[PDB]
Design a protein around this nucleic acid. Structure first.
Lengths: 84, 309, 183, 309, 309, 82
DNA sequence: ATATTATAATATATAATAATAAATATTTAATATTATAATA
């Protein structure tokens, strides 16, 4: 869960995908610390979706380094450097 | 000086490779011209990625070699494109083992250094800084021919002769701090089945085994003990290979017989035999399989000294 | 039960509204967004509605749109969502923008809604992710069959066929206009 | 910054074919009609889309450069034809790979520019504006006989003449800024290998040679010094090719050979050989091919003074 | 808007063969019964589909155009048989490839239009309406002997002589409103492989030439400088034809090698190469066939002014 | 319910054999007062001929041979896909 | 006259998607309280 892999959860019989993100989300919801947009940004997000990016990694990359009053090619470039 | 040396003078490769292309790029660098794409390929385990890293080390340009099977995704390809800058070099391992989407997002970068990105939706024009792909594949035979046409320089790797292998053993043992004699260096080179980096690994193993039974110095008795424990003689014949060839000379006297017949005789799987056993002997003049069957030289018989006309 | 009301407004005490439908007023609340679309006192209004039955109470909820009722109902079917949460959400933001944010699964635009925790935001986004759908004449049937033979899906073909050209046009020109589109 | 002539007269490399297609262009212009269907085949990679774009500017109309994956479904091509207009043209590629349903849809599309489609069977007839359907394939042999017989213009593309290859070398070196020699131009024309891209690669590499070995000068002696060692030959051979020839002739004496046996003996997988080295030599004809083994012809025997069985 | 000859007398060439089909036409008009099943064999370019549709028009019956390559399943055959009605006809091309099950289905379908295949349970007893299956293969040698024996009508379609092809050129120009000189008609008639389709294509090329390079109709000099711009000799050469002739007179020294080897050298499909090559080169007798290969005559080698060794 | 038929009820979507058979069990006490052989033969012949099983049955059921022979209804069923 | 094996097709183990039926799990609404960030 602290590694956030659903594959280890779903091989257990009776455990599907939806149960796996429920376990992940609702345990990361504070129990497991202890051991027991603009046109340019929308264009960028759509380009990332068309280039294999799932929307969450296309979302928090935009959120971390937003682009302001300048053209798309450079903040998408530094965002691609940003996600590394 | 490391496990793999990074100096062009510290690696005694093929004389054509030792002469031409790194001297060419050494005298060509500094012209404010982006280097074109260069391919190196051959037998596996020969450090083609390491050799590309060496070359980029003398070029003095930021470089990170990444494995193609690891990087299946064009998004990480865009990440490596944006990580580097104008006039840089990049080394890719096993280009032929890429998912095709990487290839068609890579062709316009080979065309005009252009990253055409799809999002009435329209594609966006995303230019790239000048850069260079250095190719290091085991076998890029199934790669697409237009991608070859976009690539400029290709070098092969071949079974190195005994002198080059002996010099490689000597320089790598000097790196290892060994006291091996030149006769022992030749013995280690002949025991190694060519393959200069795998020959270096075999020399490392021989050095460790000799240090287990003594010091770093290697004597012909130490070489004989290493051959006995590895069950591989100076001719490079495997113990399984030696047993199979002894059975063949004890049955058909080297006559041309079927591969299936000998496979049934030895109770071994024939495809593994074809891809493992006879290749090592057949780069040299040992096995001469014909439309009638397999033919074996008497030089292979010189290991035991029994031959027929 | 209750699916829609077409009645006359009696009084406005936001958010609680009373709708006198043929002598009897109906206790219904509307969001403040719908407060920006209510008529004056005494004016008739048609509200798409859907009830909620509790153990000790019956609560009536009425919206300007049927699709708003459906989204509200699907929000109520969620295990951790009450009516107060859904009214807070839709009083913050409107319907298709929330739909696209559900496609985005972004918490920043929904945390700003008052009284909403971040944990609520990610759990609702994850359990509301897109499993739903995104929000004949002789010439019509001929075009549908022609584009089926051309490889276009019947639902995909029909929306391009019936949109731009008019009613009972020439088959050639209307097939032309249907195939005018690109993606 | 790709190499591309601007005009059809500016296009140089097939002068008779260029004159023929210029005649076709002026026939389209003078008659005030859409030009006939032009069939194009030849080398696989030659930038045919760019040439179709040049033809588009010569017509002054738009050509939608489309291929097999673009037109694999009849709906996509039908939509593109609906957005096509009078006097326009459509570039089509990978026609051979396309489904026969595409072929039957394109029967009335060129057959006087109509369209017939079925709906207890009902027939729906549609019309299309006149246009210039452009069919270009890597190989036109897979085109069906009624379709190809119903077409009009058939145009063949091929590697340029040796003097005309030398002129193309001179023009590209002038574009690249290399101080090339006409003797060097004829040299690289002999090295052109039938491919403009590898030719331009050779111009770049001999420019590097002149930069690092000479004083920025390309002459016949400089070109010979650059292209008479390693994988080079005046005719087009490589030391890879010479190694393959020698290893075939010392083993089987110009007889039938086993391809797996050859791949094992050469330390080199047969796939890359039959992808680059064998197809060029058989393109020169110098290897005769049998279903029981590939044998070189009398030209290679004359190259090394070998007999004929 | 089709040029297509909708008349029997338009294809007046092969007057004995045409009169033979005329006798069969009037026999069909007089029988008013089920005809014998037709299988015509002849090289393409002569309009065999045109001949079949002319046969249908003279019968006053509707014709469906299909081919052996089109069909793949006996269910498709049943569908095609059902779509036809009484007083119909089916044109089928290249019956030479067919699934055997289709053949045993067609055996009663051409015996008495019957179908008696298995469903065990109830077998089919479908009797087809009276309509004649017309075969238009190129060569009947490759197809099955029982089918060739079972087909009633068999005829040899040959390349048309100079006067018929000149007449076809003149009447096709009359359809387009143009006029041809009798000498130019004769030279393009003895050229273009003696085939009306290739003759019409050449007519279109020469009429475009006269539209731009000429200033009027086509005369002998107009056609001559057209072939000069078309790079076509008095025999009707092509650039590919000249290259292949040069390869098999020079590279292979008479070309006693199989058609597969030369086709792979040319990267040409087998069927297209043989269809282009055999009829015109055999009627000129330049090259015969041997099991070693398609070796040339002495006359072909002397055509280029080269003496036989 | 009077005929005690199950497979008629089973073909309704969401109906298991146990569900319909129970419905029989309680309804027989609740209620107190209150295509041919050639049709399947054509489908089998088309399936063995090479036709896809569901579109062949679609052609068979589009114009069945209720009042005419199996060969003629196959003849008019092959009209649909041409 | 026997194999043999150098090239030519081939058929399915292993990727995938699409109902489906047994097996479950079955509560939020209101309100103090306490931090908590921001504030005269």
């Amino acid at each position: 869960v602290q590694a956030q892999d659903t594959s280890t959860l779903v091989k257990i019989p009776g455990v599907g995908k939806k149960t796996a993100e429920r376990l992940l989300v609702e345990l990361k919801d504070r129990f497991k610390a202890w051991e027991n947009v603009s046109s340019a940004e929308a264009d960028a997000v759509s380009a990332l979706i068309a280039l294999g990016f799932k929307p969450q990694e296309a979302s928090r990359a935009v959120a971390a380094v937003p682009g302001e009053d300048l053209s798309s090619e450079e903040m998408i470039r530094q965002a691609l450097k940003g996600m590394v | 000086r490391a496990i793999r040396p990074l100096k062009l003078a510290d690696y005694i490769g093929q004389p054509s490779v030792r002469e031409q292309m790194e001297l060419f790029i050494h005298a060509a660098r500094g012209r404010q011209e982006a280097l074109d794409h260069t391919l190196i390929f051959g037998p596996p385990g020969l450090g083609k990625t390491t050799l590309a890293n060496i070359i980029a080390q003398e070029m003095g340009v930021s470089i990170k070699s990444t494995s193609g099977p690891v990087l299946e995704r064009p998004g990480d390809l865009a990440a490596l494109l944006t990580n580097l800058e104008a006039g840089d070099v990049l080394f890719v391992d096993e280009i032929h083992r890429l998912s095709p989407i990487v290839e068609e997002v890579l062709y316009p970068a080979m065309e005009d250094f252009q990253l055409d990105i799809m999002i009435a939706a329209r594609s966006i024009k995303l230019d790239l800084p000048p850069f260079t792909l250095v190719g290091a594949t085991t076998r890029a035979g199934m790669l697409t021919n237009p991608l070859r046409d976009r690539f400029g320089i290709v070098q092969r790797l071949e079974f190195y002769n005994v002198e080059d292998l002996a010099t490689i053993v000597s320089r790598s043992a000097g790196i290892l701090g060994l006291e091996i004699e030149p006769q022992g260096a030749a013995e280690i080179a002949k025991r190694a089945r060519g393959t200069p980096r795998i020959a270096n690994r075999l020399l490392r193993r021989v050095r460790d085994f000799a240090e287990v039974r003594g010091q770093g110095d290697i004597t012909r008795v130490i070489a004989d003990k290493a051959l006995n424990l590895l069950d591989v003689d100076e001719r490079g014949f495997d113990h399984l290979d030696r047993r199979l060839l002894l059975t063949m000379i004890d049955k058909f006297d080297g006559g041309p017989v079927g591969i299936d017949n000998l496979a049934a005789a030895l109770s071994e799987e024939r495809h593994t035999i074809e891809d493992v056993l006879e290749p090592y002997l057949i780069q040299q003049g040992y096995i001469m399989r014909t439309p009638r069957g397999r033919v074996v030289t008497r030089h292979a018989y010189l290991h035991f000294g029994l031959n027929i006309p | 039960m209750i699916g829609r009301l077409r009645g006359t407004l009696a009084e406005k005490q936001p958010p609680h509204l009373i709708l006198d439908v043929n002598g009897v007023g109906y206790e219904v609340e509307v969001p403040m967004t719908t407060l920006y679309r209510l008529p004056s006192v005494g004016e008739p209004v048609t509200l798409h509605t859907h009830l909620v039955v509790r153990e000790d109470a019956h609560l009536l909820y009425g919206f300007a749109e049927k699709r708003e009722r459906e989204l509200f109902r699907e929000l109520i079917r969620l295990n951790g969502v009450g009516p107060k949460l859904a009214l807070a959400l839709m009083s913050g933001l409107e319907v298709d923008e929330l739909v696209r944010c559900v496609q985005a699964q972004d918490t920043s635009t929904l945390v700003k809604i008052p009284g909403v925790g971040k944990k609520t935001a990610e759990r609702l986004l994850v359990e509301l992710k897109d499993r739903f759908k995104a929000w004949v004449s002789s010439a019509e049937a001929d075009a549908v069959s022609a584009l089926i033979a051309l490889g276009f899906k019947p639902q995909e073909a029909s929306r391009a066929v019936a949109a731009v050209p008019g009613e009972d046009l020439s088959s050639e020109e209307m097939i032309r206009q249907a195939l005018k589109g690109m993606v």
